[model samples]
Target: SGPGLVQPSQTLSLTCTVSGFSLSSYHVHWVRQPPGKGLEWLGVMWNDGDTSYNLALNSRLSISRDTSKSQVFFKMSSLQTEDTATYYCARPELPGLTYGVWFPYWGQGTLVTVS
Candidate 1:
C-alpha cells in the first residue's frame, strides 16, 4: 500500500519500486480503479522514453522511471475526492513490442484517498 491520505488541490506523487528486472528492458504503465469500479488507464511510458496518456488526464499526469533505482514515478496534480483510487504500476504483455495493450503484470495497488 502507499499513501492513504492526501489533501485536496495538491499534487499526488507515488513511486513504484521494483526489483528483479531491468527497467530499461520493459515498459511501465499507470493504472487506477476507483472503489468498486473498473480499471482506468492513466498512461504508459516506454523504456525508450516515448509516452502516451489517457486524453482525460494528459494535462495533469506524468509517468517516469529511474533506471538506476528500478523505480517508476507517478505524479498527478489537483487532487479531488473523485481522484481517490487504488493506483498500480504495471507491465504490459509483449512490452516493448506491443501497440496499445492491457497490463499482465501489476504491482500491488496503493490505495490513495483524497479529502
Candidate 2:
C-alpha cells in the first residue's frame, strides 16, 4: 500500500518499485478500482519505452518507468473525489489486446484517498 492520503486539489504521486525484472524488456500498466467496483485500466508503459492510455485521463494522467531503478511511476493532477481508489501497477503476459490475456503481476496497490 502506498499514497495513503492526499489533500484536496493536490497532485497524486505514486511509485511502484519492483525487483528482479528489467523494465526495458517488459510492459507495465496502471489500473484502478473503487470499493465494490470493477477494475479500470488507465494506461501502460511499454517495454519499448512508450505509452498508451485511456483517453478519459489523457490530460492529467501519466505513466513512466525507470529501468535503472526498477520502478514505475504514476502521477495525476487535481485529485478528485471520484479518483479515490486502490491503484495497482501491473505486468501482463504479452503486449496487445488479444483474447484471454492475463496479468501475471500486480503490485500490492496504493490506497489513494482524495481529501
Candidate 3:
C-alpha cells in the first residue's frame, strides 16, 4: 500500500517497491472504487506514454512511470464530488504479451471523499 492524497494540486508520488522486481519490465495500472460502487479501471502506464484507460475518465487521469526511481505517479485534476473515489495502484504479472486478468500486487486503497 502507498500513502494517501498528497493534494489535488500537488504531485501524487507513489512507490511500488516489490521484492526482487524491476518495475521497468512490467506495466503499472491504477484502478478505483467509489464507496458502494464497483471497481473502475482508471488507467495503465508504462515507462513510455503508451497507455490505456477507462473511456469515461480517460481525460481526467494521467499516469507516469519512472523505472530508475522504482516509482509511479498519478495526477488527477479538477477534483470534484464525482471524483471522490477510492484509488488504488497495482502491478500485475503476466507472461509474454498476454494481458493478465488479475492484479497480483496492489497498494492499500486511498479513500477520497469530496467535501
Candidate 4:
C-alpha cells in the first residue's frame, strides 16, 4: 500500500511481491473488495505488457509488472470512498484461459482506506 490513507483525487500504488515462480511465465491479476462488499476484478497484467480491466474500473486503474523482482503493480486514480478496499494480487490457475478461472493463488490482501 503506497499510502495508509489517501484523498478522493489521489492515486494509490500497491505492489505484490512473489517468489518461487517466474513472473513472465504466468499472468498476474488484481482483485479487490470494499469493507462489506463482494469481490471485484480490477485488472490484469501480462508478460507482454497487455492489460484488460473491469469496465467499472477501466478508466481509473492500470496494471504493470517488474519481472526482475517478480512484482506486480497497481495504480488506481480518481479515488473515492467506494475505492477503499482490500487489494490483492493473484495467479490464474490456467495461463491462457479467461473468466471463471481466476485467482487459484492469491496474496493476502492489502487494505487501503480513502477519506
Candidate 5:
C-alpha cells in the first residue's frame, strides 16, 4: 500500500501478509534500489517493536509488522526525485536472537519513477 516516486514526494504505505509463518520469530526489513543502481538497505523491524535504520536515510524510513493482522507495513516521509526507485521488503534470518534477521526475502520490486 505504498506509493511510488513517480508521483513526487509520494507517501508510501505497504502491507505484507503471509500465512504459515510466525512474524514473532522473525524480522522484516525495508530496502530500495535506484534504477540501475545497487541495493540500499532501509531498516529492520522486530516483533518486539524494535527497529534499526540505515545511516543514509534513517530519518526518512520506517517499517512495521503485525501478527494479529498477519501483515507488515512500511512508511517513508519527505521523499525526493532521487528517491525514485524500486522498493522491497525483506525478512532477515537471524539465529537464536531471531529466526530471520540476516539475508532478506525481498518482495517484488515496486517501480517508482519521479516526475
Candidate 6:
C-alpha cells in the first residue's frame, strides 16, 4: 500500500504493492471515493495482459502495472478538492466457483485528502 497527500491542480502518484502473489496471476482493481461519498472506479488490471481505466475520467487518469514488482501504479492529474478520497486495490475473490467472482478485500483503500 502507498499513501499520498496533495492539493488541487497537483498530480497524484499512487501505488499499490502486493506481496505473496504475482500481479500477472490475479485481477487487481483501483477504486476510490470520499469518506462518505459515492465510490469511483479508477481502473483495473487483469491477469490476461488486459487492463482498463474508467472512461469517466475524461483523460485525467492513467493506470499501469509492473509485473516484475507485483505492483500497480496510478497517475492522476489536475485534480480538485473534489478528488479527495480513499483509494483501493482489490484482488478478486470467489474460490471454487465457475460462475461469478467478487472482490471483498480492498485493504481499507486508505484516505487521500485534498486541500
Tell me how many clashing residue pairs each candidate has: 0, 0, 1, 0, 12, 0
* C-alpha TM-score for every candidate: 0.86, 0.85, 0.74, 0.87, 0.79, 0.78
Worst 10 residues of 3 by lDDT: 6-15
Candidate 5, residues 1-115, lDDT tens digits: the string is 4554456666667676656677777677778788878888777765578788877657876777777777877776666677777777777677436443476574787776667
lDDT for every model?
A: 0.80, 0.77, 0.65, 0.80, 0.70, 0.74
Model 4: per-residue Cα lDDT over 3-75, one tens digit each? 4687787888899888888887878888888788888888976546779997877799888888888888998
Instruction: Give the TM-score comparing model 2 with the true structure, all chains together.
Output: 0.85
Please tell me which predicted candidate would have the highest lDDT against the true structure: 4
Q: Which has the higher lDDT value, candidate number 4 or candidate number 5?
A: 4
Worst 10 residues of 1 by lDDT: 93-102
- For model 4, the superposed segments whose C-alpha errors exceed 4 Å read 97-100
Q: Give candidate 2 misplaced runs (Cα > 4 Å).
A: 97-101
Q: Is candidate 3 or candidate 5 better by lDDT?
A: 5
lDDT of 6 by residue, 54-110 (tens): 666647877788889877787888877877888887878743247554775546676
> What TM-score does model 5 achieve against the real structure?
0.79
For candidate 1, write residues 58-104 as lDDT tens digits.
78878887999888888888877777888988776664454556566
In angstroms, give how far residue 60 of model 4 lies from its true place.
1.5
The reply for model 1, stretches above 4 Å from the true place, is 95-102
**Winner of 2 and 5 under lDDT:** 2
Candidate 2 vs candidate 4: the TM-score winner is 4
